[PDB]
Amino acid sequence: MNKQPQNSALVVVDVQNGFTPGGNLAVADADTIIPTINQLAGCFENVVLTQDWHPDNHISFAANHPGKQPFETIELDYGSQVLWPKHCIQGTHDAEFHPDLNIPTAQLIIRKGFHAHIDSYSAFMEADHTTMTGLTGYLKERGIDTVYVVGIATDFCVAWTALDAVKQGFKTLVIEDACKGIDLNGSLEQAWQTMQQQGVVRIQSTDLLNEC
Numbered sequence: 001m002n003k004q005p006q007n008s009a010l011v012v013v014d015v016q017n018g019f020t021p022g023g024n025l026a027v028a029d030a031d032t033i034i035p036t037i038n039q040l041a042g043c044f045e046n047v048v049l050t051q052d053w054h055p056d057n058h059i060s061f062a063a064n065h066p067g068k069q070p071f072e073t074i075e076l077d078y079g080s081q082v083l084w085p086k087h088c089i090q091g092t093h094d095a096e097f098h099p100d101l102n103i104p105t106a107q108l109i110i111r112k113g114f115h116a117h118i119d120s121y122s123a124f125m126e127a128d129h130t131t132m133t134g135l136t137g138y139l140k141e142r143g144i145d146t147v148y149v150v151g152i153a154t155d156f157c158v159a160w161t162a163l164d165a166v167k168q169g170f171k172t173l174v175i176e177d178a179c180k181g182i183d184l185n186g187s188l189e190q191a192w193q194t195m196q197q198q199g200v201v202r203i204q205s206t207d208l209l210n211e212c
């Protein structure tokens, strides 16, 4: 294939059982993006997978906060936190990659959200805005300056990963038809707006696949 250059990477965000139909935080139709992701990954020299990877006592779970229910919000030290159903607990079926995901060439699996008291939608920086995950250092050591983001959810882990990539100096693109969103209280269109404002490029898979 006519692959993307060595300075670009595909970051495949949270294509896990937990976020796909049948999972504990199932995003409708999120499994339908997987064939596109599998095909895209073949076109990149460098591919990183992310995995939401929570301990059972994670702060982002509604179940760990008395009197709160999923999809409500809570004020934590670091700001507003959406509370979720328990999802993607370390070592469980829910946290596994979706069985249709097929990227044997993937070079890194970075887990996130493993600190009990801090969420991390972004693969680059945790929800405290200060705890760096290691991904920036990894990518820059490998000479990567351009990041393409796909996966689930468009408006949370994808958007926050993309916005953090921009903050860290990467040319950042999101491949829209290889993402699926959840849209809580208008989050989906707001994520696209904030991403566009910050210079994230919104592209379609055919844009990349037609030069592969």
Ligand SMILES: O=C(O)c1cnccn1
Binding pocket: 013, 014, 019, 052, 084, 121, 152, 153, 154, 155, 156, 157, 158
């Ligand atoms: O992958 C995501 O977008 C995500 C992760 N944890 C909770 C909710 N959403």
Ligand SMILES: [Cl-]
Binding pocket: 063, 084, 085, 086
């Ligand atoms: Cl739950």
Ligand SMILES: [Cl-]
Binding pocket: 091, 092, 093, 094
């Ligand atoms: Cl299990």
Ligand SMILES: [Cl-]
Binding pocket: 130, 131, 132, 133
């Ligand atoms: Cl840090």
Ligand SMILES: [Zn+2]
Binding pocket: 052, 054, 060, 087, 088, 113
């Ligand atoms: Zn999570």
